[PDB]
């Protein structure tokens, strides 16, 4: 016979705006790291960094010419951050003939490979081949005027190819 | 043979997952309906409209201050992130033996003549002891229910 | 009252009528 | 206490041309130094818009009931803030939900209730004798409010509320839309110095507030502020004057526009792709210079 | 104009290739994560196809 204070909760959807909603979570901000971002209405991957854009007060999203997300406003802070796609590229194996040697050099194309001897070039960066100041004819083309060859007790060298 | 061949596609993997949501400030007035000093009678149960606010059912589920927490049509741990157009909160006083009759498909004096739930009723029910507040020395006669 | 199913998706057809 | 207003002279409304007006931001996306083509409800360039006038001189006080097809572009060339708010709905007989927006002398009121609107709703501003100032003294908008679904009141503030005898010096623009139960309002204020006619130039209306309402918005009605004083004796039906006030009404249509964004992300120009063949060339080439 | 037209043609081809990623092609949505999260794999397989 003890009195019980009861509450009855009813929920329904009337093909109407979701006036009532529940929160999921929130995390601390991370910059200069390839992360999977979640925001008010977009999800994806990319590298977030401090920007210098001029978003309007009512605007929250950024789009480039090709209609790809560029910058996103922070929901909890009046700060706007550019989104740079996480680095990617092709992996090219530079080798002489297998009958010559088994030493190979690897070219990570179009990446600043401080993120991946090591030689940085305009076609990516060449790992496994040493850079020399001499100039020869092009044996194995790499790009941007750089060629590689199996010369000098032997290794793979990277030089600027000589026109003649 | 001697030459350069493309073999793979290098790409940096994401280190971790980051989630950012807007500041929680438009909290629903659940603290008032659940802690009201006085409540309406069984036959004149009041209906409270809750809308245009953010609701937190996780704290209510983990509050551990409610004797009975039964959900119909939805899991108690699944509606935390789910959204509804309108929220209805009906609160009244029910006898200890009558608390089991507040459910869809039930039959009884209060169920049939005071408050009838739909056969396809959805939501959750809240119930907790109130003998230390709704009972007084000499008898409390402020609650009316139809017979 | 009882409402058509085309208008309510999640909730029950029955609505407040007191 | 709903009342009727008599001694009103009915005249055909004037018409004015929209010289590149009614352009608003279609979304909350920032774009810099690009040209974007959007298919949204816009006000067509160089279109006749109904002109409503209010003056005494004649007893001109225009506030009819106007349809709501898909959207409304609202302007107000005012010097003393006479036009205050708007009332929406379908029947206004308490059987259907109605939307009400009023900026009274204290707060702006936005609410949705099944109001029983009066035949001729208005706001009464009276020049009291105790103090030499103008302020609201009557509230004759609706009659009853059985139930309410939404109601919002902003922070208190004050306005001049004085009937300046000069010329129009402020321009207020508004766009109202409703899709999938979302009531959206855009607005912008531009300083002007003119007597009549809609000013030239370009202006992009930034978003103001979004209202999730979900009704049947069949039509709407506008409101004004009435001047009443002992200098014009009379009853509640004739003892009143409207003052120097004017506003325009323009309807939105589904059109395709080529929006131009500057370096800082502000819309600076636009092209109506269905105006003339030159605009068709501009839209097809996605450029402003051909 | 010859060199400029070559550059313009290649740029237009690349831009159209990029913009073709925002098309539904009869699917529910162009975003792959959206269709992955909204629906279960056994039914979303046809949209992904
Ligand atoms: C809640 C609401 O505004 N409902 C509708 C609106 O969606 C529609 O555009 C308009 C057209 O008459 O009628 C009303
Ligand atoms: C959101 O809440 C945090 C909590 O301290 C606060 O620091 C922050 O300023 C809030 N956001 C805004 C925009 O004020
Ligand atoms: C590559 O990274 C180095 C840092 O080691 C930096 O100095 C250089 O500017 C970067 N180059 C490019 C093209 O980003
Ligand atoms: C090439 O010459 C530069 C200076 O011109 C020097 O810094 C570098 O060490 C030289 N490298 C080799 C492999 O000789
Ligand atoms: C105003 O006049 C109209 C004309 O028919 C009438 O229907 C309405 O009831 C009147 N209202 C008042 C308040 O006199
Ligand atoms: C954009 O903002 C900068 C910041 O001062 C300003 O110098 C420039 O004139 C602006 N561009 C306009 C107004 O078109």
Structural summary, described in words:
The structure is cut from a larger assembly and holds 4 copies of chain A and 1 copy of chain C (18 residues). Chain A contains no helices and 15 strands. Chain A has 164 residues and is mostly beta strands. In chain A, the strands form 3 sheets. A 5-stranded antiparallel beta sheet of chain A has the order 3-4-7-6-5, with no helix packed on it. Chain A is elongated. Chain C is largely without helices or strands and 18 residues long. In chain C, 0% of the residues lie in helices and 0% in strands. The N and C termini of chain C lie close together (10 Å). Classes of the chains: A mainly beta (164), C little secondary structure (18). The site of one 2-acetamido-2-deoxy-beta-D-glucopyranose has 4 residues of chain D, from loops.
Concise summary:
The PDB classes it as viral protein. The entry lists the keywords Glycoprotein, macrocyclic peptide, Complex, Inhibitor, viral protein. With 164 residues, chain A is an all-beta fold.
Topology:
The structure is cut from a larger assembly and holds 4 copies of chain A and 1 copy of chain C (18 residues).
Chain A (H helix, E strand, L loop, with lengths): L2 E10 L7 E2 L12 E5 L7 E5 L10 E3 L5 E5 L6 E5 L3 E8 L9 E4 L9 E4 L2 E4 L2 E2 L8 E4 L2 E6 L3 E6 L4
Chain C lengths: L18
The complex binds 2-acetamido-2-deoxy-beta-D-glucopyranose (6 copies).
């Amino acid at each position: 016979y003890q009195p019980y204070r009861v509450v009855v909760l009813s929920f329904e959807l009337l093909h109407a705006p979701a006036t009532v909603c529940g929160p999921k979570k929130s995390t601390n901000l991370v910059k200069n790291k390839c992360v999977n971002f979640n925001f008010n209405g977009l999800t994806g991957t990319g590298v977030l960094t401090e920007s210098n854009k001029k978003f309007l007060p009512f605007q929250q999203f950024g789009r480039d010419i090709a209609d790809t997300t560029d910058a996103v406003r922070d929901p909890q802070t009046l700060e706007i951050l550019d989104i740079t796609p996480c680095s990617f590229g092709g992996v090219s194996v530079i080798t002489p003939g297998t009958n010559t040697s088994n030493q190979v050099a690897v070219l990570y194309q179009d990446v600043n490979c401080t993120e991946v001897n090591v030689f940085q070039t305009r076609a990516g960066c060449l790992i496994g081949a040493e850079h020399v100041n001499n100039s020869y004819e092009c044996d194995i083309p790499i790009g941007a005027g750089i060629c590689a060859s199996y010369q000098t007790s032997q290794s793979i060298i990277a030089y600027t190819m000589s026109l003649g | 043979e001697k030459g350069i061949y493309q073999t793979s596609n290098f790409r940096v993997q994401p280190t971790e997952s980051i989630v950012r949501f807007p500041n929680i400030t438009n909290l629903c007035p659940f603290g008032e309906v659940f802690n009201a000093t006085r409540f309406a009678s069984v036959y004149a149960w009041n209906r409270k409209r809750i809308s245009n606010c953010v609701a937190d059912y996780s704290v209510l589920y983990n509050s551990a201050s409610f004797s009975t927490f039964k959900c119909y049509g939805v899991s108690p741990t699944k509606l935390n992130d789910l959204c509804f157009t309108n929220v209805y909160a009906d609160s009244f006083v029910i006898r200890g033996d009558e608390v089991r009759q507040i459910a869809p498909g039930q039959t009884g004096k209060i169920a049939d003549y005071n408050y009838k739930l739909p056969d396809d009723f959805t939501g959750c029910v809240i119930a907790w002891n109130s003998n230390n507040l709704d009972s007084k020395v000499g008898g409390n006669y402020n609650y009316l229910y139809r017979l | 009252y009882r409402r058509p199913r085309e208008q309510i998706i999640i909730g029950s057809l029955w609505v407040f009528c007191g | 206490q709903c009342v009727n207003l008599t001694t009103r002279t009915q005249l055909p409304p004037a018409y004015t041309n929209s010289f590149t007006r009614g352009v608003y931001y279609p979304d909350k996306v920032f774009r810099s130094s690009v040209l974007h083509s959007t298919q949204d409800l816009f006000l067509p360039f160089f279109s006749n818009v109904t002109w409503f006038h209010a003056i005494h001189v004649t007893k001109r006080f225009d506030n009819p009931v106007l349809p709501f097809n898909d959207g409304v572009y609202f302007a107000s060339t005012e010097k003393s803030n006479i036009i205050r708010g708007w009332i929406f709905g379908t029947t206004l007989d308490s059987k259907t939900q109605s939307l009400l927006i009023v900026n009274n002398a204290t707060n702006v009121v936005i609410k949705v209730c099944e109001f029983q609107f009066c035949n001729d709703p208005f706001l009464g501003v009276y020049y009291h004798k105790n103090n030499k100032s103008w302020m609201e003294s009557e509230f004759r908008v609706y009659s009853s409010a059985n139930n309410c679904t939404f109601e919002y009141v902003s922070q208190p503030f004050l306005m001049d509320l004085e009937g300046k005898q000069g010329n129009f010096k402020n321009l207020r623009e508004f766009v109202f839309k409703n899709i999938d139960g979302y009531f959206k309002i855009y607005s912008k204020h531009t300083p002007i110095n003119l007597v009549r006619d809609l000013p030239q130039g370009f202006s992009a209306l930034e978003p103001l507030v979004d209202l999730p309402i979900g009704i049947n918005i069949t039509r709407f009605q506008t409101l004004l502020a009435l001047h009443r004083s002992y200098l014009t004796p009379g009853d509640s039906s004739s003892g009143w004057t409207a003052g120097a006030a004017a506003y325009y009404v323009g309807y939105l249509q589904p059109r395709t526009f080529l929006l131009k964004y500057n370096e800082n992300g502000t819309i600076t120009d636009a092209v109506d792709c269905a105006l003339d063949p030159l605009s068709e060339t501009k839209c097809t080439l996605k450029s402003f210079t051909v | 104009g010859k060199l400029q037209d070559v550059v313009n043609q290649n740029a237009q081809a690349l831009n159209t290739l990029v913009k073709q990623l925002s098309s539904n092609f009869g699917a529910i949505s162009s975003v792959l994560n959206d269709i992955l999260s909204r629906l279960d794999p056994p039914e979303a397989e046809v949209q992904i196809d």
